[PDB]
Design a protein that fits this description.
part of a larger assembly, 2 chains, A: 211 residues, 9-stranded antiparallel sheet, two-stranded antiparallel ribbon, 13 strands, globular, B: mainly beta, 2 strands, Tip attachment protein J (chain B)
Chain lengths: 211, 52
Amino acid sequence: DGWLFTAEHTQSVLKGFNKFVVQYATDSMTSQGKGLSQGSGVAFDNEKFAYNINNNGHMLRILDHGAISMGDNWDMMYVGMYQDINWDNDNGTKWWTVGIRPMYKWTPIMSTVMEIGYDNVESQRTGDKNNQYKITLAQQWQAGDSIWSRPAIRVFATYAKWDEKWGYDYNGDSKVNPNYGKAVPADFNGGSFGRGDSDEWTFGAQMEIWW
Amino acid sequence: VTIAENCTINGTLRAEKIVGDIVKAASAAFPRQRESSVDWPSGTRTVTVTDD
């Protein structure tokens, strides 16, 4: 069994909104973290064998996200999140997220959208940190003059640079692996866990719509 | 010793090599290569049988 208490304040500012939410979950409500309970604490491995994912502990989530409009040409989404999952088996995490997404409208149909995001997750049982920052630039055509106007077709280029010092050991199965599902340092006994330290750039086209 | 007919032992017969109408056997396991906490069989084994 478990609990989830949430308090959210939404303020109407600059033709948009800002939501500041504080959430506190205990026990079975911490494994998923959105409001459903998983009180058994048992999961199936790759070969359909049961293993313990016990979720005794708590989770604190302080979030502030919003959408703002500056001028007749500038729109913005912004995000700031701190989520600390503290578990009794020490397999929790501490996740910081900071994100911005501005949008400049040349014409009521065509706009240029940027997005810069930063993630930083520290493992509870190893103390290591995985960080990443991603910058994407897109040119988009949308059915309206708002950052929420959908039928949107974008051509984008994304560049993400990351450095990861820990990962999850999912090699083998739960019977032969004692660290199955546990956070381990990236250089644990000659293994390679996480995505390492690197960077990558992608590009392409996409469409998003809600109707 | 060469015996041209039946030989009977009422106690314990202890020979090093026995040559005739017997079942010889050998067994081994493949070498295991490992990393972190996971190992897998990968290697070579050789079984030699002598024409004696």
